[PDB]
Write a protein that binds this ligand. Structure first.
Ligand SMILES: [Fe+3]
Ligand SMILES: [Fe+3]
Ligand SMILES: [Fe+3]
Ligand SMILES: [Fe+3]
Lengths: 322, 322, 329, 329
């Protein structure tokens, strides 16, 4: 059985544009080092971004800000003015992670964590189990401010973050994290694939119309308008046949699974999670910020107690709503 | 309706022996100031205790260490060697709050908070709703190392702390905290009274025999042996007739309500909690560390979701235990 | 583990056929052979067939009316609501009048449409385990006979008056039936100590219990309602009332021939039913029972699978509670 | 809101009395008046009384055996387990033999002891709302008549063969009954759109559904089991199977006179029952229903009080789940 983090602190474990740039290069190595030195508990170090960078930020912050009220989903359009008014979300200044993290935490409890560059799906997903998002502090090269070969502070901030501010989305994400914990490769890859057609390139239901909630969609200008058109062949979010689906990395996907809601996708996920054959069950304890392995009979005595009291609340509340 | 904290950070709101001592006096004012300056989030400041103090600590740490395996309850005798081996619980050194707090947090999530001196039952109990204990950093005067007119670092550390390390006890305490939130004076006082015959001077059930789990009992040498004898008239922990019970402050209580268990007392407490007439219901969110007022229909949609997923875990787990 | 009925028809073992001077009428050769006549009816009664009717005698019909009159006055006064509500329906339907003794087949047939409780003629008396066992099927073991006319204000044991003007009216109430049944399902295979404990509870509840009707207290106990002297006594300020707390109620020791100073006050029958549901879980049983009203059959579960069963049940109910919330905005 | 039966006896409104050339036997004056004979039985049938028996004719008994023989061979092969299990009991008990047509009173009386499902003779056909409504009481509206002997391998509608050698065996299974009943409780007062949706589900499940038996697939559909030609067709690799997903199954449009390329594969009846429980919550109803097998009565709840009811139910079950854990160490 694959190894997985039990504690939150246990997470401590040329075609590229700008490859010829000695500065940007050493700059991106500067950011990575920050990551390698970052240990949970301490505030995310702040950085003094450069204009050549701040320009690229505003070039994307302007190009996308127009298509959000249009193509972006509600939960996005709702939180944005709060992100702008609070975490310094403006085309003239790049938002500081410590702020966004500190912010997201009060919304859902999701904290940010600076990742060197990239990491396994098992590792990425594992962070979600603790409502921890591994974010990139760096930024794409100014050469092509409309394209990134991988996640940059724009994709993470103007794509992922706004969704992680939504109550229903967080639990949903966390589910996948709890699922991936100790899951066999085949399923790990399957979840990643789901994570794609959902978190990265997913489309939600807003009444009759369809909106874009995918992080890869929201941060990408060209696909934001493409996924909303009548060119791609939409399908229902069915985790069963969605995990099998093969996709391209460098280009647009003709398939975009339409989820009813995050609260709803959550259930097919839990299902896909129940599908995950694990020799046990795990539960996250937000108080001890530990991961509880449910295998013992006394381990269940306490989860039972947790629920028992919580419903007792749900009842008393309900009893008072005549 | 009385005002109560919604956020954890909202908690930011001559007969005495040593009264003639100008030093100890200004010393205890030194400790209090620490409290007044302490704001949530920052580590509890450490202090260099004096020998005249360290002597009094060891005089109590020795006198009581003998009667614990005897009169103290199991959960106490179990955690002690861990407190001694970890938070520096030795007669030669006074334990630092930042350590104990940091410790207790990993056990149940209970964090310590330095309180100036004393505070209302409503305020004290209110802290419990966030699994926050208001502790005294100071110590009794060396004149009479076997008596304290109020809580000192000995009563809090060698009386309360060990119980707050127990999983079942924490939820129990928290219940009272959640109960007291916005509760009318009459009930606030009633809860305090319960808190007494339970947390302060309560006796538990350990098979057939009776043990002492009360904080006031464990920190007090004279009553530790008295409550265990056949002189007081024991009664069952019945929150209904326990809240009415009137008690003395300066002396021993002939009445000591015997609770089956903390997991058990918890239910009569919840009951006594259900007795508390509040125009609503509140729920604590460990992720956003906020206090949720359940009054809206959408407020329940989410609590329902929390439970739904948690049982789904309880089921999957159970399903795997044939 | 004691033997218990799995099917409703298995109660035919209680009244198989095979297997006291101080009593008023002991010297009466007629009443004697009369009460043996009634018992025989019981021994011959098998589930499924209608309860045989009987032509009661005047010496009996007089005793019936002597009790039907003495108590009819104190019911709207001391008796509980659920009683005062159903009575006019019992009177208007099952022939509840001081001039005629009600026929069991009628009462049974009646009670069945109200809650599903059917009556069953019992020879005389039976173990608490056997009695309670019938409740698990919503079956009440009733006496077809009647006390001796010598003392029409006293009975040393259950007679058609105690059963009809005491138990029956309560078994017509929806909440009370499930409650009773709980005890029945509890007693199924329960160890003696707990069987006796339940009986004791059954007493301070079904037999001599007092309920809550707003602020005041009413009598709902079957032994109270059928007894004139205690009906007015339990309602006075002489006995020391206590709360219905099954924990310390089962320990309580009581007298059989006289009045009890203790009368546990239950909030409601709906309230107590729960106090019994859990108490059952607190009962040492290498299994768990489950009644199926569709097949009138009891199912015996293994604590482990019983565990799993609860899990699924909860997991289900909650999701629906989730969906319910969604549409209600 | 459409009218629905509150009591089991209220189904007497379905077969009140008041309120096609292509058919084989349309030109037959005897068979015609014979089938009108059967219908009249229905119109005169009131709940509670035993289903009248009939002396079937040889021209009929031949058609019965022609179907009882043709299908008896493909059951152990294509039919589902629950079917192959109960059959020898149906044969050994309700007179299921090619030489004699089984009497409804027997089958009904039988099914009742298995799950509680009672049969009810229906004139001919009835609305989906009415049909489903019977299921809420575990009551099946069955046809007493039989197809015309001209074509003993085809019926334009349900006949005593389809009902007995197709539906009945499934209604003998514990899990299937509750499942069916769910739909019945669902349809109670449900708006047309959903009524039709349920019917459609009822089709791809009860009528033409396929279950899961390990790795292989078996036929449990009533329309499949009674039809020889489709029994072997649904089991082959010609139709495009899909998972039982009530969401996209209700939308699915099907043909009436011919074979369906789609046959939704359900894991189990116990599995589907849930897919129906929740689907009911997802149904727009200014109320919620609740069946009481003890009084054979439906109770209509107000979403709000229904909410509260769920809360208490959950809150209760969990505490017991708590106590259960304690004793099991
Ligand atoms: Fe991403
Ligand atoms: Fe204290
Ligand atoms: Fe009695
Ligand atoms: Fe059919």
């Amino acid at each position: 059985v694959p190894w997985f983090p039990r504690t939150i602190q246990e997470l401590d474990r040329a075609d590229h544009p700008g490859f010829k740039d000695p500065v940007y290069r050493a700059r991106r190595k500067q950011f990575a080092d920050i990551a390698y030195n970052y240990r949970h508990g301490q505030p995310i170090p702040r950085v003094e971004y450069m204009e050549e960078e701040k320009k690229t930020w505003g070039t994307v912050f302007k190009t996308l800000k127009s298509l959000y009220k249009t193509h972006a989903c509600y939960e996005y359009n709702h939180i944005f003015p709060l992100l702008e008014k609070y975490c310094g979300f403006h085309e003239d200044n790049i938002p500081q992670l410590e702020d966004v993290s500190q912010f997201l935490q009060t919304c859902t409890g999701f904290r940010l964590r600076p990742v060197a560059g990239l990491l396994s799906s098992r590792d990425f997903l594992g962070g979600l189990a603790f409502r921890v998002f591994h974010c990139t502090q760096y930024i794409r090269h100014g050469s092509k401010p409309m394209y990134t070969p991988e996640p940059d502070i724009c994709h993470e901030l103007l794509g992922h973050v706004p969704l992680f501010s939504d109550r229903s989305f967080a639990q949903f994400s966390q589910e996948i994290g709890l699922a991936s914990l100790g899951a066999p490769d085949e399923y790990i890859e399957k979840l990643a694939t789901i994570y794609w057609f959902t978190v990265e390139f997913g489309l939600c239901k807003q009444g009759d119309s369809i909106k874009a909630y995918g992080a890869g969609l929201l941060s990408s200008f060209g696909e934001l308008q493409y996924c909303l058109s009548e060119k791609p062949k939409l399908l229902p979010l069915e985790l069963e046949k969605t995990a099998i689906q093969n996709y391209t990395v460098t280009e647009f996907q003709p398939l975009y699974y339409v989820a009813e809601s995050f609260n709803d996708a959550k259930e097919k996920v839990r299902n896909f999670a129940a599908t995950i054959p694990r020799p046990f069950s795990v539960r996250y304890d937000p108080y001890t910020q530990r991961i509880e392995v449910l295998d013992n009979t006394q381990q269940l005595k306490i989860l039972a107690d947790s629920i028992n009291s919580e419903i007792g609340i749900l009842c008393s509340a309900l009893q008072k709503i005549k």
